[PDB]
C-alpha cells in the first residue's frame, strides 16, 4: 500500500546559554577520568 | 421507587465513618467530621497562594454546600437554615431560615457574585441578593441539581409527571436572560441496574438517587455533565436553539478497558473533578467504595476521545500480558479528524462570541486545523491505495489548505490515478478561483 | 425614624 | 386504575343528594335538581336585574356546562348532544349532535362571543361558530379542561405517556396562533396525597380526579388556576412566551390559619370564582362537604398576599388568641414591597399590550409605586439601624423617587453613616444626570 | 417489562411461516424466505421498467431494510453490520459495522442520495455518506422510527419517563437545522386494551409493540404517518413556527364501514404505501392476519376525507345494502368546503416554498377555489331556505368571487330575503371599493 509518511514530513515542516552548560559538564567529566 | 434527596457537587457518603466530603470543584473541596452532637467543617483550596485553608464548628448539621472563589454557601435541608461565608473577613457572614411546607426539604443551592438561589422538593424556587434581600419566588418542576460560573447558571429538573429536563440562563446585571427552560434531557438513567443487580453499592444510590455523578461548566463556560454510565456529555451550539445538540465526548470504561490490556478491572473507578479544555481532572479510586477518602489522593489528567472503537474488532486486530491493545491506523486517523473538527468548532464558537482570554488560543485553532487536514490526508491516501477514486474524491473536498491538496496530488501520482490528479487539480483550480474572488 | 417615614407618606 | 372524566369549572358533586351545581362564576351559577329520570336546570345570576334567571327541564342528562354574559352552553358527553341557550330571546336556543367514536366522550366545552370549542377523551379538538357551523378539527394530547376570553383560549392536557401539560393560544381572525402548546404544568396533583382518601374526600375526587376547583382569566386577561395545594397560581409573562413563568400569589391555608389567630382549624375552605385586580372572588365552604351546598351562600372577597412567612416565628412574634396575628414591620414591609412590585409589573404588562380596560389603571399603578418605595424605606431604615452599610446602599438603588432618596439621606444622617450619606447623594447625582438626559 | 425493538417501514411479521416482507414503499417491496440456515432476499419494484428485480442470499440475518431509487440498505440490529447495494453497476456494494455498546441495538435506518443514517435503542444518532464516510455522532432519547427525503429527516423517539416525542430536521449544506426537537407526538396507543390479545393482533404487537405501520413524506415533502388506530395523520403548517399542527385527514375504518354498506367488516385491513395529492396508495388486506400475505396482493388507492360523518344519521338518511351509504348534500358540502380549504392551504404552502413540483398545481388550485365557493353556496342556500339571515350573511362573507356574491344575491332574492339582498349588495359594493384601492 501507498506510503505517505515522507509526504507528510515535507508537508508538515513548512549557541545558547543552555548548551554551554552541557558542554561544561561534558568537559568536566572527561577531564576527571582521562589519564 | 424514586424519592427526592439533597445533593451537592461531588460529595461522598459517611460510609462506616464519622467524616465525609461535602463537595469538590477545580478551586477546592470541603470536608466535615462529626463530634458526638456537633460537627467540624474544613475548607481547602488548590491555589494555596491566593487563599487560606480554614475550619469552624457547626451545631446545626448542615447537609448542603456550594463553593466559588468568592465564598461558600451552606444549608440545612430539613430545618431550612442557611449561611453564606465570604472568603474575605471584611464582609461578615450572614444567616437566615427559609419557610418550608410540611415534609418539604431543600434539594440544592447555588450562588453567583450577587445572586443566591434555593430549590425544594415541592418545586419552589426562591432567590435573594448577596445580602439576603429577597427578589422573587417561582413554581417549577422539582430541581435536582444546580451549578454556576460567573453570571451563567445551569439547572436540572425532574418529575414523575414531566420527565427529565434542564434549563440554562444568564443572570446579567444589565438583564437576566433565559436560553433554555425545562427542555428534555437525554441522560442515561441507573434505575434498572439498581433494581436488578443488588450490587451492595445501594448506599451510593441512596446517597444519590438520581445517580448524576457530577456536573460543571467547562474552562470556557460550556455546560458539562458526567453520567451514571460513566460517560462525559457536553452541550454544543447552545447559543443557537435550532442547532443546539448534546455530544458524547468521552467514555471512561472504554479507556480503562484499553489501559488494562482489554481486561475487566472493575476494581478501578474514575471520580471526575473538572474539565480543563480537552483534559479531564479526576481521581482514580481502587477498592470496595467507588469514591475517594482522606487524606486526599493526588489527581490525574486524561484526554477526551471520540467513541468509535469496537472491543472484538480490536482484539482481532491485536491478535507483557497487560499490554494496551493496538488499534488500526484508520480508526486513529478517523477519531483524530472527528476530535479535531469538534474541538475547532467549539473553540471557534467561543472566540466568535467571547473572544480570547489570553491572546494565543487562535494558535491552538490553527494547530487543530493542521491536524484535521493531516488526518484526512492519511484517510485519503488509504482510499487512493484501495483505488476507490469515488471515496478518495469525496474525501478531497474536505481538505482546507492547498498545501494539503498539493500533497493529495502527489499521493494520487503515487497511486497512479491520473484521473484523480486531474479532478483534484480541477478542484484546486476551482478553489483557487474562489480564493481569487 | 418614624417621622421620616411620615415625611415619606406626605 | 385511572379513568378520564367530563368536567365543568366550579360545579359540585351531588354528595348523596338530588341536586348539584354545574358551573359557577362572577356572572352567575348553574344549578340542577333531579326529578325521577328527568332533571330541572336553573341559570342564576349575580345580576338577575340585567339577566333574566330562567329554568328548564333537562330530558337528556346534560353533564357539561359553560356560562357567559350572552348565554349558557350545555352538553351530553355520551350522546354528543349539545344545546346553547341565550339569555335574551333575540338569539335562538339551538341544539346540535357531535360525532363520537366508540368509547369516546366529550370531556369539556367552551364558548365566547367570537368562538366555540369542544374537546374529547381521544384528544380531538373541534371548533365552531356561535351557530354551530364547524371551522376546524385537530388532534392533541387528551384534553381535560378548557377556558376562553374573546379569541384567547387556554387548555389543559394529560396522559400517562405524555405527562401533565397546558396550551395557550389565540384563535384570531388571521389564524389560530399558539403561544404555548402542551407545555409542562407545575401543579401538584391531588393523588400525590394518596393517603387522604377518606369517604368524604373520595366522593369529591371521584367527581373531580384533577382536584382543580377552577381555571380562568384575570380581570386583566391573564391565565390563573387553583389546585389541590389550596393555592392560587397566576401565569406571568404569558404575552411573551420566551419569558413565561407561573407565580404562587395566594395560599388559602396560610390565610385561614392566620385569620383563625394562627390556628390549625379543620373547618373552613375556599371555593374560588374569579380574580379581580388584587382580590379573589370566592365562596366560603364549611365542614366535611368541601364543595359548596344548597342554598348557595353570598359571595366573599379575599386579597392576594405573597407566601413569605414562617408559622413558628409568627407565633413567637405574636407572643383574644383567635384574633389574626400581629406581623412584624420587617415582614410586613417585605411582603408589601414584593406584592407592590408583582402587581405593578403585571399591570404594566396589561396596559402596555391591551391598554386601559377600565380607564383608571394609571392611578392604581401610581398608588402601587408609592406603596413600593414606602415599603423599601421601612426596610432601608431597618438596615440603617443594623448599620449594614452595604445592604442599606443596595436597598437605596431599588427606590424609584428622588423624594425617597432624600428621605434616605435624612435616615442615614440619623443613623450617623456619613459614608452612606455621601454615596446616596452620589446616586442622587447620577439619577439627576439620568433625569437631565 | 418493556423492551425496545427494531422497525422497518411497512414490513410484515413472519406469521406462522418461513417468509416475510422487510419493507415496502412507492419504489418497491423487499421479501425474504428461509432456506435451511440461510435466507434468500428478493428486491422487487413497482417499476421494473426503470429498475431490475434482483435477489441474493443473506447469511447475516439483516433484520432491518430500507429502499430508495438509488439502492437498498440492509442492517443487523444485534451485530451492528450494515450493507448498501446500489441498483446500478456504476457504483459498488459496500458494508460496514457500527460500534454498538453492550445492551445496545440498532432500531432503524434510512438513506437518501446525500446521506445514510443509523439510530439505536440507547438514543445514539450516527451519520455517513453514501460511501460510508462518517460525519457525526449525536445523542437523543431512544429512537424508534426514521424516514427521510433529500435533506429532510423525520424521527420518532420514546422513553418511559419523557414519553413519546418526535424531531424534524434538515441536514442543510450550510448546517443541520432542527425545525422541531423531541416535541410530544399525539398518536393513539393500542396495548392497554385487553382486546389486543387476539392472535393476529398479538403477533403484530410482539413484532411491533408501537403499533405504527408506516411513515413517509407526502408528495409535497410533508411528514405523514399511519398508526395503530388506522388513521392517516399529516403534520400541517410545519413551515410555520406558531401554527404547526397534526391533522387527522383520513379514517380508514370509517371508509371501510361506509364502503361495506354501513357494516362492521373487520375482516378487512389497509396497508399504507405512499401519499399522492389527496389519495393514499395502499394494499387492502383480507382475512385474520392483518398484514399482507404471499404472493403480494395488488396496489389499491383511497381518498382523504374530513371526519364529518355520523353513523346513525347516515343510516337514517340512507333508509344490495352492501353498496356505500348515502351522504346528504349538507354533509357533502360541509366536507367538501373543509377538504377544499385544507387542500388549497397545503398546496399554497407547497407553491410558496417548494414551487410547482409537477407543473399543474395552479390549475388544481383554481379548481379548488371554485369547489370551495360552490360548496359554500350550497350551505348558503340551505341557510337561506331555513330563512336564517344571520347564518346566510356569515356564509356570504366566506365566499371569494364577486361572481359568487352575485349568485348569493339571486339566491337571497328567491329566498325572499330582501334584508340579506341589501346587506350582500353592501358587501359587494365594499369589496368593489376595496378592489378599487
In terms of topology, how is this protein built?
This is part of a larger assembly, with one copy of chain A (35 residues), three copies of chain B (437 residues) and one copy of chain C (10 residues).
Chain A (H helix, E strand, L loop, with lengths): L4 H8 L4 H17 L2
Chain B lengths: L18 E6 L3 E8 L2 E8 L8 E5 L5 E4 L3 E5 L5 E6 L7 E4 L8 E6 L3 E6 L3 E6 L4 E6 L3 E7 L2 E8 L3 E9 L4 E9 L6 H6 L5 H6 L6 E4 L5 E4 L4 E6 L8 E7 H8 L8 E9 L2 E8 L13 E4 L7 H8 L10 H26 L6 H25 L3 H8 L5 H13 L3 H19 L1
Antiparallel strand pairs in B: 1-2, 2-3, 3-4, 5-6, 6-7, 7-8, 9-10, 10-11, 11-12, 13-14, 14-15, 15-16, 17-18, 18-19, 19-20, 21-22, 22-23
Helix pairs in contact in B: 5-6, 6-7, 6-8, 7-9, 8-9
Chain C lengths: L1 H8 L1
Helix count of chain B?
A: 9
Distance between the termini of chain A: 56 Å
| Overall geometry of chain A | elongated
The secondary-structure element order of chain A is: HH
* Oligomer state of the chains in this structure: part of a larger assembly
For the sheet with most strands of chain A, the description reads:
none
The percent of residues in helical segments of chain B reads 25-40%
Which structural class do you get from the secondary structure elements of chain B? alpha+beta
Report helical residue fraction of chain A.
over 70%
Which band does the percent of strand residues of chain B land in? 25-35%
How many DSSP helices of chain A? 2
PDB class: replication
Keywords: Replication, helicase
Entry title: S. cerevisiae replisome + Ctf4, bound by pol alpha. Complex engaged with a fork DNA substrate containing a 60 nucleotide lagging strand.
Chain A: DNA replication complex GINS protein SLD5
In short:
Chain B has 437 residues and is an alpha+beta fold. Helices cover 27% and strands 33% of the residues of chain B. Chain C is elongated.
Describe this structure in words.
Chain C: It comes from Saccharomyces cerevisiae (strain ATCC 204508 / S288c). Chain C: Belongs to the DNA polymerase type-B family. Chain C: Catalytic component of DNA polymerase alpha, which in complex with DNA primase (DNA polymerase alpha:primase) constitutes a replicative polymerase. POL1 has a role in promoting telomere replication during interaction with CDC13. The structure is cut from a larger assembly and holds one copy of chain A (35 residues), three copies of chain B (437 residues) and one copy of chain C (10 residues). Chain A has two helices and no strands. Chain A is mostly helical. Helices cover 27% and strands 33% of the residues of chain B. Chain B is built from nine helices and 23 strands. In chain B, a hairpin with an 8-residue loop joins strand 3 and strand 4. Chain C is 80% helix and 0% strand. Chain C is built from one helix and no strands. Chain C is elongated, with a radius of gyration of 5 Å. The N and C termini of chain C lie far apart (15 Å). The chains are: A mainly alpha (35), B alpha+beta (437), C mainly alpha (10). Chain B binds chain D through residues 91, 97, 99, 122-124, 129, 131-134, 137-141, 159, 161-163, 165, 178, 182, and chain D through 163-165, 184-186, 188-189, 233, 242-243, 245-248, 306-311, 313, 334, 338, 379, 388, 390-391, 394-395.
Amino acid at each position: 500500500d501507498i506510503n505517505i509518511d515522507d509526504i507528510l514530513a515535507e508537508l508538515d515542516k513548512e549557541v545558547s546559554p543552555q548548551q554551554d552548560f552541557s558542554d561544561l559538564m561534558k568537559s568536566w567529566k572527561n577531564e576527571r577520568c582521562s589519564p | 421507587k424514586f424519592r427526592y434527596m439533597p445533593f451537592s457537587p461531588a460529595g461522598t457518603p459517611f460510609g462506616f465513618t464519622d467524616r465525609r466530603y461535602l463537595t469538590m470543584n477545580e478551586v477546592g473541596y470541603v470536608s466535615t467530621v462529626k463530634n458526638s452532637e456537633q460537627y467540624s467543617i474544613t475548607v481547602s483550596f488548590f491555589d494555596v497562594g491566593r487563599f487560606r485553608e480554614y475550619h469552624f464548628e457547626d451545631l446545626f448539621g448542615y447537609d448542603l454546600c456550594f463553593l466559588n472563589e468568592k465564598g461558600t454557601l451552606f444549608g440545612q435541608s430539613k430545618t431550612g437554615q442557611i449561611q453564606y461565608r465570604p472568603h474575605d473577613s471584611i464582609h461578615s457572614n450572614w444567616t437566615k431560615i427559609i419557610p418550608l411546607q410540611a415534609g418539604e426539604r431543600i434539594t440544592s443551592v447555588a450562588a453567583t457574585p450577587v445572586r443566591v438561589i434555593v430549590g425544594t422538593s415541592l418545586g419552589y424556587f426562591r432567590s435573594f441578593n448577596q445580602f439576603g434581600v429577597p427578589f422573587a419566588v417561582e413554581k417549577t418542576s422539582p430541581i435536582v441539581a444546580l451549578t454556576a460560573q460567573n453570571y451563567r447558571v445551569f439547572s436540572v429538573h425532574y418529575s414523575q409527571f414531566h420527565g427529565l429536563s434542564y434549563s440554562l440562563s444568564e443572570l446579567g446585571t444589565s438583564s437576566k436572560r433565559y436560553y433554555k427552560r425545562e427542555c428534555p434531557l437525554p441522560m442515561s438513567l441507573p434505575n434498572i441496574n439498581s433494581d436488578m443487580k443488588k450490587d451492595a453499592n445501594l448506599d451510593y444510590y441512596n446517597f444519590n438517587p438520581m445517580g448524576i455523578k457530577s456536573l460543571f461548566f467547562s474552562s470556557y463556560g460550556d455546560p458539562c455533565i458526567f453520567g451514571s454510565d460513566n460517560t462525559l456529555l457536553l452541550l454544543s451550539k447552545w447559543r443557537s436553539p435550532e442547532e443546539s445538540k448534546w455530544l458524547p465526548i468521552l467514555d471512561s470504561n472504554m479507556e480503562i478497558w484499553k489501559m488494562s490490556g482489554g481486561k475487566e478491572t472493575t476494581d478501578i473507578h474514575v471520580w471526575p473533578l473538572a474539565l480543563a479544555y480537552d483534559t479531564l481532572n479526576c481521581i482514580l479510586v481502587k477498592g470496595k467504595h467507588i469514591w475517594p477518602e482522606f487524606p486526599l489522593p493526588l489527581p490525574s489528567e486524561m484526554e477526551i476521545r471520540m467513541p468509535v472503537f469496537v472491543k472484538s474488532k480490536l482484539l482481532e486486530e491485536n491478535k507483557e500480558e497487560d499490554k494496551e491493545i493496538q488499534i488500526p491506523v484508520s480508526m486513529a486517523a478517523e477519531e483524530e479528524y472527528l476530535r479535531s473538527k469538534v474541538l475547532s468548532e467549539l473553540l471557534t464558537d467561543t472566540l466568535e462570541n467571547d473572544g480570547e482570554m489570553y491572546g494565543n488560543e487562535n494558535e491552538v485553532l490553527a494547530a487543530l486545523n493542521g491536524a484535521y487536514d493531516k488526518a484526512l490526508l492519511r484517510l485519503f491516501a488509504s482510499a487512493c491505495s484501495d483505488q476507490n477514486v469515488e471515496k478518495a474524491l469525496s474525501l478531497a473536498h474536505e481538505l482546507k489548505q492547498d498545501r494539503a491538496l498539493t500533497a493529495a496530488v502527489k499521493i494520487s501520482e503515487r497511486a497512479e490515478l491520473p484521473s484523480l490528479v486531474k479532478k483534484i487539480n480541477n478542484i484546486r483550480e476551482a478553489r483557487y478561483e474562489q480564493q481569487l474572488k | 425614624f418614624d417621622d421620616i417615614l411620615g415625611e415619606f407618606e406626605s
